Amino acid sequence: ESNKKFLPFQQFGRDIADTTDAVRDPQTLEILDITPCSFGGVSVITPGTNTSNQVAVLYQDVNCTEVPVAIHADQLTPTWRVYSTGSNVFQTRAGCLI
């Protein structure tokens, strides 16, 4: 929900990249705000395949109160189901580390 005061002739609202970030609902004349659902980058920490095949995974600039429903946890293999939620979870300023 928004605080935007639409004039009666306007339907949508745009921003600096020309994408709609506010709309008027066509049944109850109220103004909603649009925001994309969360994304980011994924990088893998490895000690080299010579030493081991055990890796760690860093999710950039998020919290891990929001990770396991973002990544396809139950939709994918069990092998991505250890690196989505486990007992080794640390929160850093570069995102949180699993």
Binding site: N3, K4, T35, S38, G40, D61, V62, R93
Partner: protein
């Protein structure tokens, strides 16, 4: 009789910054911020019409540095506390006092 108090660190702050260093920090204002963990922000709020949210919503991120601002201050304190008590000798071997 030499007084290095304004360039050596003081313990009262929560950092190792001297009196000239935080004078230097409060003069470089930013055209855009870096990371304030603005990813819980920009979702669902109405004050999302700054620069950084519109950048971040199009794939454009900012990665954090490896050394923080509290490690660089420890480096420049260790460089400055060796010049005073050793002179030119600590950068050629072992610190010999004089």
């Amino acid at each position: 009789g030499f007084n290095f108090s304004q360039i050596l660190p003081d313990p009262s702050k929560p950092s190792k910054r001297s009196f000239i260093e935080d004078l230097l920090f409060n003069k470089v204002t930013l055209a855009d911020a870096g990371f304030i963990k603005q990813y819980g922000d920009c979702l669902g709020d109405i004050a999302a019409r700054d620069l950084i949210c519109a950048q971040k919503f199009n794939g454009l991120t900012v990665l954090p540095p490896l050394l923080t601002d509290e490690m660089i201050a420890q480096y420049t304190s260790a460089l400055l506390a060796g010049t005073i008590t050793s002179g030119w000798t600590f950068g050629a071997g072992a610190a010999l006092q004089i």
